[PDB]
Amino acid sequence: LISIFTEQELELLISGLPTIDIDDLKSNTEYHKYQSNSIQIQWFWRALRSFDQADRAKFLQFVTGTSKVPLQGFAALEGMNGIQKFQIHRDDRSTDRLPSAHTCFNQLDLPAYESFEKLRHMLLLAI
Amino acid sequence: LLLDHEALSCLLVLLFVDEPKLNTSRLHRVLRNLCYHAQTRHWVIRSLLSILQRSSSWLSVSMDAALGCRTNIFQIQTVHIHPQAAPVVCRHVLDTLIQLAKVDFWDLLVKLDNMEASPLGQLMNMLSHPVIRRSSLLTEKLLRLLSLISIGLTENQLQLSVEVLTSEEGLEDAANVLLQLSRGDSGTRDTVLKLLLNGARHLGYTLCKQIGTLLAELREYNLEELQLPSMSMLTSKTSTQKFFLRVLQVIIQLRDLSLDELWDMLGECLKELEESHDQHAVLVLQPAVEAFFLVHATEQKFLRFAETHRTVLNQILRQSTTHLADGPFAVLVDYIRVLDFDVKRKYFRQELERLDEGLRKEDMAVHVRRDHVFEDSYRELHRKSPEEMKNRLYIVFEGEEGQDAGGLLREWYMIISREMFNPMYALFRTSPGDRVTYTINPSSHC
């Protein structure tokens, strides 16, 4: 009866869906090769705003390794080497592979997907 | 022979006169007791059935039938019942026949005025006759009657038309009739199955025509909320969707129909409703989807369906209060990627309550010390049974005042969920990488 949930959903069942201040995450995001006004980034933020609370939580687990929201806000987001902000990296490999996460750095590698629909599809398929 | 046919005829005249005061249940019990004598029963029933057929001065009984029309129930000039009164004479006779099923007359009647299993064939023919075929009430009563009695080809065609045309209780009694007839003979089983299939194919063909108009009008609506008038004949309580689903549920109940032109256009119709950025707009095809998953997913194509419509089947299930594992969509319990988290949460909680529905749950005390809660709870509970754990725990802290038990329990769960991660118990330790998560402490053997 528990095996109907995913490994994310059992956590979301035990500890509940957090309320994610996307404005706090965006305020505590670091962009390395993308920029905050890149079109794929506006698509990323549009997608993440369009995702329901469960897919948002599954995203947070994908990139941070947990659904837990820091009480002080994402400015206090910890990583392996001290307080690490969330971070989006452009994945310069081919754009037919999913984004990839390194949760100990809170690190997202994100291919430069050509469109909103495909980026949304690939992210939703990843989570 | 306790009573003669003139005294029985005098009693049976009471079925025609519609008096609210008259105790007709007492009259039914009089006729029932009299009908323990087999020859009396046989004459009574042959007369009541002649009254039904004739529905399809002492005898001056004026029934108010319509506005400004006070009819005489009997027209004697060979005795006929005025068709305005007929539906009431039918209703009282079917009321009596339902009790006799739980357990000449005309010439006698004019002589006064001048001063189970065999007739099942007549009662099945009765479905064709207009005063009955009009009235949903008389149809429901006659179907209840047939459902009692059941404990040929035209008579089954007329029984099936009761489903292909317009009573949920009466049509569930019709389901009982069609089953209990099929229990009788393999030949009636086969003929009723094939004539059900014939009606379901008619319903499918006209449903594909209707959904084809719907899809076309959605094309013309988009290519420039949804209140397409083509939707009315799907929303309707008597829509071919509900007839098709009803018939398929009876087919599947008799099992213990090739329509890919329907299923692929239901497909593109659902896909064009979902692309049209409205959500409940799908639900006008929910019963066609439930038909799809009835005919398919026999106790595959439904899996490709649940993939290409995944979010649609989720919209369906989330809207439906039908319990996932009691409805038709239960098969996908095991293909779980095709449901939403909160849909799975509801299925979880309903199946958990279903499995433990036999357990009476009590309230249960837990006496703990604010400074020892963890070890006092371990002592109290760790030998308790699972069903004792499933009782609702209320926690008492020694000498503390009364407080809201729900808030105090929530506090209790919070303190425990903390103490789990107190290193003094060595149960859980933070990931050296994350430092906010927790996994089993491999040093808990201390």
SS (H, E, C) B222-243: HCCCCCCHHHHHHHCCCCHHHH
Nearest residue to B100 via CA among B178, B35, B165: B35
Class of residue B163 by CB neighbours under 10 A (exposed 0-12, middle 13-18, buried 19+): buried
DSSP H or E run through B37 = none
Cα distance between residue B364 and residue B26, in whole Å: 53
Answer yes or no: are the C-beta atoms of B272 and B215 closer than 8 Å. yes
- Residue pair B270/B198 in contact by the 8 Å Cβ criterion: no
**Residue position matching structure tokens 């066609």:** B288
Any chain B CB within 8 A of the CB of A4?
A: yes
Cα B154 vs. chain centroid, distance in angstroms? 27
> If DSSP codes are grouped into helix, strand and coil, which group holds residue A100?
strand
Residues of A in contact with B341 (CB under 8 A): 5, 9, 12, 54
Coil, strand or helix at B249: helix
Which two structure tokens, joined as six digits, stand for B139?
A: 């149809």
B396 phi, psi to nearest 5 deg? -115, 120
CB B348 within 8 A of CB A1: yes
- Say how far apart CA B227 and CA B155 lie, in whole Å: 41
Residues B15, B242: Cα–Cα separation, whole Å? 36
CB atoms within 10 A of CB B65: 18
Three-state SS for B214?
helix
- 3-state class of A67 per DSSP? coil
Q: Do A5 and B437 touch (CB under 8 A)?
A: no
Cα A32 from chain centre: 15
Residue with tokens 């004792």: B388
Helix or strand (DSSP H, E) at B79: strand B79-81
Instruction: Using CA coordinates, name the residue in chain A closest to B353.
Output: A1
Q: Is A24 on the interface with B (CB under 8 A)?
A: no
The residues, ordered by sequence, that sit 6+ positions from B352 with a Cβ below 8 Å of its Cβ are A1
Method of determination? cryo-EM
Give the number of residues written for chain B: 446
Task: Report the catalytic residues of A.
Answer: 104
**How crowded is residue A69: how many other Cβ atoms within 10 Å of its Cβ?**
18
Chain B nearest-CA distance from A79, in A, is 6
Amino acid at B183: R
What is the Cα A17 distance to its own chain's centre? 15
**Is there a contact between A12 and B341 if contact means CB atoms under 8 Å apart?**
yes
Q: Where are the beta strands (DSSP E) in A6-113?
A: 29-31, 78-79, 82-83, 86-91, 100-102, 107-111
Ramachandran quadrant class, B68 (left: phi over 0; alpha: psi -120 to 50; beta: rest):
left
Q: Does A103 touch chain B (CB under 8 A)?
A: yes
**Beta strand ranges found along B332-405 (DSSP E):** 363-368, 392-397
Tokens, residue B247: 């018939």
Residue B440's SS3 state is: strand
When computed from its CA atoms, the radius of gyration of chain A, rounded to whole angstroms, is: 14
Closest CB from A4, A68, A70 relative to B348: A4
- Reduced to 3 states (helix: H, G, I; strand: E, B; else coil), residue A119 is helix
CB contact under 8 A, A78 and B435: yes
Nearest to B436 among A4, A13, A66 (CB): A66
The partner residue sitting opposite A9, judged by closest CB among B341, B434, B436, is B341
Q: In a mutagenesis test of the A interface, which of B333, B339, B436 is the best target, namely the one with the most A β-carbons within 10 Å?
A: B436
Which residue numbers of B have CB closer than 8 Å to A's CBs?
Answer: 333, 336, 340-342, 344-345, 347-348, 351-352, 355, 433-437
In the A/B pair of chains, how many CB contacts fall below 8 A? 39
Q: Are A48 and A57 in contact (CB under 8 A)?
A: no
Q: What is the Cα B430 distance to its own chain's centre?
A: 53
Please tell me the distance from the alpha carbon of residue A69 to that of residue A72, in angstroms, as a whole number: 9
Residues 28-57 of A with CB under 8 A from B: 54
Residue A100 contacts B, CB cutoff 8 Å:
no
Percent helix, percent strand, percent coil in chain B, to nearest 5 = 65, 5, 30
Spell out the residues 6+ positions from residue B420 whose beta carbon is closer than 8 angstroms to its own.
B427, B428, B438
Burial class (CB in 10 A: 0-12, 13-18, 19+), B117: exposed
Q: Closest CB to B436: pick one of A1, A13, A68.
A: A68
CB neighbour class for B109 (10 Å; exposed up to 12, middle 13-18, buried from 19) = buried
Coil, helix or strand for B71?
A: strand
Pairing of strands B69-72, B74-76: unpaired
Residue of chain B with shortest Cα separation from A2: B348
Chain A: nearest CA to B394, how far in angstroms? 20
